[PDB]
Design a protein around this ligand. Structure first.
Ligand SMILES: Nc1ncnc2c1ncn2[C@@H]1O[C@H](COP(=O)(O)O)[C@@H](O)[C@H]1O
Ligand SMILES: [Mg+2]
Length: 247
């Protein structure tokens, strides 16, 4: 579910509505917990491929050799397909791209341009039709300067860039989502009503940097509402760090 009405956030949805119909690769820039996969997804369902598959993959998770074959597959009942084939006629979401190895990056470029996967075993190359979407919170141009990311790929990958505003730059929305989250939590722990946040809880919420953004805000709130466990008076104690053993 998409929440938030801050200008920056709205301008993004607008950008997304126009980009989605195209087949050009899209690049999303943003911190963790900012909704990258959601946005990526939104692109898919608003596109013409909305009926094709929507695939995902977190590059940072696999080791070089594993990611390579996990992306373009390999010869295994008789063959192990890659996310590209599994996304054929659909969209492929590559998260944490900045972590992909040069080998893969280079290999990844060819596919984008040539629209085909290379293959061995006396088998002809594979033709794929995939709309690409990638996310990262890194400074790719910076990485191109350190030679850690291929400049040619960047030129090509980045048909256009979507940049999700971190939570701290949307303040307008911090109380809005906290309220929403608090309320879902009340429904689960069966509280009659959400009693609201004292000024202190607000001060806290609005002053935190929210490094984990929306995912963090959510967890902090549910946790907080739980510790409070009552509808008799406003929530005052915001548990940012579950490791501090309050009082
Ligand atoms: N507009 C939004 N409304 C509610 N939850 C969101 C929103 N955007 C992101 N999230 C949460 O943020 C997390 C993912 O963001 P990301 O790290 O970019 O994939 C997910 O747990 C979401 O469900
Ligand atoms: Mg994600």
């Amino acid at each position: 579910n998409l929440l938030g009405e801050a200008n920056s956030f709205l301008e993004v949805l607008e950008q997304v509505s126009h980009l989605a119909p195209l087949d050009k690769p899209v690049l999303i820039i943003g911190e963790r917990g900012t909704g990258k996969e959601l946005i990526a997804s939104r692109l898919h369902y608003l596109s013409s491929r909305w009926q094709g598959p929507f695939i995902s993959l977190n590059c940072a998770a696999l080791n070089e050799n594993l990611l390579d074959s996990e992306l373009f597959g390999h010869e295994a009942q008789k063959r192990h397909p890659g996310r590209f084939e599994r996304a054929d006629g659909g969209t492929l979401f590559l998260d944490e791209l900045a972590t992909a190895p040069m080998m893969v990056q280079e290999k990844l470029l060819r596919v984008i341009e040539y629209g085909e996967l290379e293959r061995v075993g006396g088998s002809q190359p594979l033709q794929v039709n995939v709309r690409l979407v990638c996310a990262t919170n890194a400074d790719l141009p910076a990485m191109v300067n350190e030679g850690t990311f291929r400049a040619d790929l960047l030129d090509r990958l980045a048909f256009d860039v979507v940049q999700l505003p971190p939570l701290r730059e949307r303040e307008s929305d911090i109380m809005l989502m906290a309220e929403y989250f608090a309320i879902q939590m009340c429904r689960e722990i069966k509280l009659p009503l959400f009693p609201g946040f004292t000024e202190r809880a607000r001060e806290t919420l609005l002053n935190y940097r929210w490094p984990g953004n929306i995912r963090e805000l959510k967890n902090v709130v549910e946790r907080s509402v739980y510790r409070h466990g009552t509808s008799d008076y406003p929530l005052d104690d915001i548990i940012i760090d579950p490791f501090k053993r309050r009082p």
